[PDB]
């Protein structure tokens, strides 16, 4: 029993981590067969970044001026490519600890962790929701930017987020591994701000199941709804709306615990509407929704890697 | 900017997990050079651990009854001890993975990731504190034991904990990695309940600067106190004694943020006596204790290893 927000083991992705020097900017790249990507904006300095024209900066760079160092070695740079945001390093050695892995983009909603890095070397773990304004609440310094978010399924790494920027109230925002930004966002030192963010209706559902599985249960009620009643009610808390989709990712919990996810909902529709009354949940004096159905299952099953 | 629970990255203990087998009853083991390392009880049936005499038990065992899986290769044991409530198991392959390492015991506050494990394979990672009624709150399921915590230094892993069993209220016992349990528990399957815990108050001093460092500064105010009326007001509130090598620990985020330590000690006073008003701090709706001074300091200035 018990339940912690927990991220993946890190150890496949702290094998591909490398720093990329360019003139005097560093940050961090992701070495995967012979191939280093990294954010382009390494090839930026401070007063480029305010205004950047990537295609004109990277055409006055050539191979060798990229340092790409894998802990005390350095990987000689035999050529070099932009795709979106960004660079893609080719290099003459492979990777010997590339694990399996694919490139993914992941959903509003969808979790994953985070390897924290800075100069190629690893800080921390932790697990981040991409939010439905396409931010992470995630915790970067600089120097974090190539920072990679990830999660494995047996023994294959999905690389899902690379780090670039920090928007106003410290809140992240990056691209996944093709350069391709989460959101509206743009790679440029411009005043640019997330929408209003919304709650995570259906993790906030997996997390009930998860507090029923370990015994907290004192806020379920006697009732059901229908879906549409719910969804009615959740739109004023600024909850996202729950579909099918959703009612069919929670039924494993559901069936798990015999509660059915329309009762669950109700039970949901009470606390939105009453408060917490000074109680917690797992803990928790507030609902969580950076768990989705999945971290829950693997999380309480001991689902390993 | 941002703030979130961070592990330490697992990668150099994912290295040295390995599944100990006896009979039919499997955990985790850590290896080590060419010692592993597991909880005794891996030689009790279900029946035996409601009383078990391992001094017992183990006369009764030889070395091929331990059955060492590192992958799929079988790790051939040639000797084996026990020490205190863990058992040593030497095999004739020392572990290329094998990190520098130390056997550390902490102390009730400090806090150390948590890589959990199950059949010798990595679930999850996450953060804990040593309680100080010597539980932690951690994640386990069957056979999590084995499991280790640990802090890392540069290039240096200290190990720390080792999991044993579960007590009531989903809280977690086990040893350092010498086999001494923390706290009065014991490796048998009988009534045992921990202490009433405390607050670890030096933690939450920290997390408050963290927040003010992050620029969440609403509740500083403009008094200050002596620690003696702060440990007075403290006490009422469940929170350990704020002693001076307390005080001399948060120097370095004092210094830094420019607030004495005895200043925060009189917001976290106001805090204490009048709640937070329905507001959070990082985002927490209650005072958080488990990252300590140097947890914060790793975060917010990017510590690698
Ligand atoms: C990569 N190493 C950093 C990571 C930042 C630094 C502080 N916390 C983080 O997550 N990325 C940057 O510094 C990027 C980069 C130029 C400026 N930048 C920002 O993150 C800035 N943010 C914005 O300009 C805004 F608001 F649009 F997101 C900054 C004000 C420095 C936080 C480029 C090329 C976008
Ligand atoms: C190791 N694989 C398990 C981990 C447990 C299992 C459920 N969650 C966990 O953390 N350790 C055990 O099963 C140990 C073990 C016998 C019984 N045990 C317990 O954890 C039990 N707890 C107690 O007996 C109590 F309350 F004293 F802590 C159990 C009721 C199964 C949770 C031995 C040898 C102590």
């Given at each position: 029993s018990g339940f912690r927000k927990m991220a993946?083991?890190?150890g496949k992705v702290e094998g591909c981590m490398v720093q990329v020097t360019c003139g005097t900017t560093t940050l961090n790249g992701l070495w995967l067969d012979d191939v280093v990507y990294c954010p382009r904006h390494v090839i930026c300095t401070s007063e480029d970044m305010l205004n950047?024209?990537?295609?004109?900066?990277?055409i006055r760079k050539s191979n060798h001026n990229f340092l790409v160092q894998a802990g005390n070695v350095q990987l000689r740079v035999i050529g070099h490519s932009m795709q979106n945001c960004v660079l893609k390093l080719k290099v003459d050695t492979a990777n010997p600890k590339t694990p399996?892995?694919?490139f993914v983009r992941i959903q509003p909603g969808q979790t994953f962790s985070?390897?924290?890095?800075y100069n190629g070397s690893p800080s921390g773990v932790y697990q981040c929701a991409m939010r439905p304004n396409f931010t992470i609440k995630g915790s970067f310094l600089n120097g974090a930017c190539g920072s990679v978010g990830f999660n494995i399924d047996y023994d294959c790494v999905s690389f899902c987020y690379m780090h670039h920027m920090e928007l106003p109230t410290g809140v992240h925002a990056g691209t996944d591994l093709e350069g391709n930004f989460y959101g509206p966002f743009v790679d440029?030192?411009?005043?640019?701000?997330?929408?209003?963010?919304?709650?995570?209706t259906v993790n906030v559902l997996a997390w009930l199941y998860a507090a029923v599985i370990n015994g907290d249960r004192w806020f379920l009620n006697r009732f059901t709804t229908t879906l549409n009643d719910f969804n009615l009610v959740a739109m004023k808390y600024?909850?996202?709306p729950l579909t099918q989709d959703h009612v069919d990712i929670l039924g494993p919990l559901s069936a798990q615990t015999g509660i059915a996810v329309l009762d669950m909902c109700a039970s949901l529709k009470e606390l939105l509407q009453n408060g917490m009354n000074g109680?917690?949940?797992?803990?928790?004096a507030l609902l969580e929704d950076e768990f989705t159905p999945f971290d829950?299952?693997?999380?309480?099953?001991?689902?390993?890697?």
């Open positions: 993946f083991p890190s950047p024209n990537y295609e004109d900066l990277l399996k892995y694919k985070v390897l924290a890095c440029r030192q411009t005043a640019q701000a997330a929408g209003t963010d919304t709650t995570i600024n909850y996202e109680r917690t949940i797992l803990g928790s829950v299952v693997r999380q309480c099953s001991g689902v390993t890697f």
